[PDB]
Design a protein around this ligand. Structure first.
Ligand SMILES: *[C@@](O)(C(=O)NCc1nccs1)[C@@H](Cc1ccccc1)NC(=O)[C@@H](COC)NC(=O)[C@@H]1CCCC(F)(F)C1
Ligand SMILES: *[C@@](O)(C(=O)NCc1nccs1)[C@@H](Cc1ccccc1)NC(=O)[C@@H](COC)NC(=O)[C@@H]1CCCC(F)(F)C1
Lengths: 303, 303
């Protein structure tokens, strides 16, 4: 028993982190085979951040402008190119610790682990979710750019995120590993801000199933609603619409607990309308939306 | 910015996990140099758990009774002995991935990372705190015994916990790495239960400092109280007494924010008396007591 925000073991990713320096800018890189991936703004200076032309800035650079450090061993840069908002630095040595990997792009509502790094050295690991406005609620300080987000499935690391910057509200923005931003954000200095956000409904129901599996049942009731009558109330509380596909994904949790998806929706409908009355669910006094149905099944007992 | 429950990178610990089998019992072990450490109840059977004599059970065992698996390679057991509630299995091979390490015992209020494992394979990492009643609020399923808790300081792994069992309320109990239980718990079948718990006051104040550093200031006030008048109210809400030593530990956070420790105590005193009025602090609607002053300094900006 127990239910916690659990990150994947970060071992496989720690062996890939390096420090990339260009001039006075130092940030983190990801070393896979003979390529180091890092945010392209490592070539920029404080003056070059109003409206930079990265193609112009990259062509005025040479291989010797990039210092790459893998722990203590220096890596010799033999090539450089840009791929969208990411730099690809060809190095002379293939990383002997390169795990089996994929570059995948995630959707709002999906979760991933983040290995926060500073100067090529990992400081901590935690779990994150991609919000509907394409921001994440992470924990990052100056020098954390280049830190990556990932999921693991049978020793295969699926890299999904690279950290680039912090938005004015304190939320975080980054790209997939192909250099394409999550959301309408740019790697230049603008007054950009995160758009409106909604609560991930399928995740809140999955977390209510984890609570039932762990003994929290005070919020249950005999009632049941229709998918359409549930969506009318969800809309008023700024919750994402629940679809029939989400009901089918919640199926295994519904089967394990003997509580129907529309039965669970009637309890969520009441929690939104009345609140919790000073009671808690899995040690929390708010409804949690950062656990997917997969995360719940992965952590909870199958009994 | 941002503030999250952040575990240490688990890489150094993942390379030490092994699977230990004795008969039909399979659990996790920790391989350091040529010794594998695991819970001693791996030698027991369902019949032997009423009131076992572990000395009697261990003497009826031989080296060939223990199968040790490090990933795929089988480790040959050349010695065995008991150290309190832990078994020490001497193996023929020294772990080449053994990091620099210490066996340290932690106090209530301290935190540590947990690498949950099943069959010698790590499944996830998360942060935990030792409560005043010597239990932890972890996330563990059948087969998780042998999972370890640790802290890292400049590449030195200080192992502080080994998981043994779950208590009836769903909380977890284990030993230090010398085999000595945290708390009045035993590794036999009894109706044992966790004692009363208190809230860790110095941790709640440290977390209020993280909120001020991260922009949450609605709970601040102009008032100030004495250490003695604060402790009278803390006692009523089941909070641990705050000492002058705790005030001196909170000093660096007080200096960074310009808010005096007794000033912060007046805000906590008001939060306990009136609640939050539907407002949140660092995304939480309850007062968090699982971040130490160290954890806050480690994660928050020094500015
Ligand atoms: C790096 O880009 C970084 O850490 N970004 C993410 C952050 N998350 C919380 C705070 S920052 C880092 C690179 C660097 C620049 C110069 C010297 C050394 C490292 N940048 C910053 O730390 C930061 C200010 O430091 C000078 N600047 C930015 O993050 C840029 C702001 C505009 C958008 C951007 F171009 F994407 C990054
Ligand atoms: C192992 O001891 C274990 O996983 N313990 C911690 C748990 N946390 C949540 C659920 S269990 C595991 C060892 C094992 C025994 C037999 C077969 C395979 C593995 N034990 C258990 O999973 C569990 C029931 O499984 C048969 N029994 C216990 O945990 C014991 C209960 C009494 C106290 C104890 F002796 F310390 C352990």
């Amino acid at each position: 028993s127990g239910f916690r925000k659990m990150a994947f073991p970060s071992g496989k990713v720690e062996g890939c982190m390096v420090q990339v320096t260009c001039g006075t800018t130092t940030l983190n890189g990801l070393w896979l085979d003979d390529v180091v991936y890092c945010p392209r703004h490592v070539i920029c200076t404080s003056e070059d951040m109003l409206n930079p032309n990265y193609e112009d800035l990259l062509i005025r650079k040479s291989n010797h402008n990039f210092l790459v450090q893998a722990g203590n061993v220096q890596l010799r840069v033999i090539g450089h190119s840009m791929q969208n908002c990411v730099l690809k630095l060809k190095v002379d040595t293939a990383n002997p610790k390169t795990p089996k990997y994929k570059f995948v792009r995630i959707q709002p509502g999906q979760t991933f682990s983040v290995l926060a790094c500073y100067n090529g050295s990992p400081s901590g690991v935690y779990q994150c979710a991609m919000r509907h406005n394409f921001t994440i609620k992470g924990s990052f300080l100056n020098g954390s750019c280049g830190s990556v987000g990932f999921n693991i499935d049978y020793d295969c690391v699926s890299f999904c995120y690279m950290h680039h910057m912090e938005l004015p509200t304190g939320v975080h923005a980054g790209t997939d590993l192909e250099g394409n931003f999550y959301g309408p954000f740019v790697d230049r200095q603008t007054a950009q801000a995160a758009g409106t956000d909604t609560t991930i409904t399928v995740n809140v129901l999955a977390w209510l199933y984890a609570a039932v599996i762990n003994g929290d049942r005070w919020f249950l009731n005999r009632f049941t609603t229709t998918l359409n009558d549930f969506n009318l109330v969800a809309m008023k509380y700024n919750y994402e619409p629940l679809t029939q596909d989400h009901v089918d994904i919640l199926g295994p949790l519904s089967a394990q607990t003997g509580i129907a998806v529309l039965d669970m929706c009637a309890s969520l409908k009441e929690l939104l309308q009345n609140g919790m009355n000073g009671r808690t669910i899995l040690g929390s006094a708010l409804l949690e939306d950062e656990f997917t149905p997969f995360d719940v099944v992965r952590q909870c007992s199958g009994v």
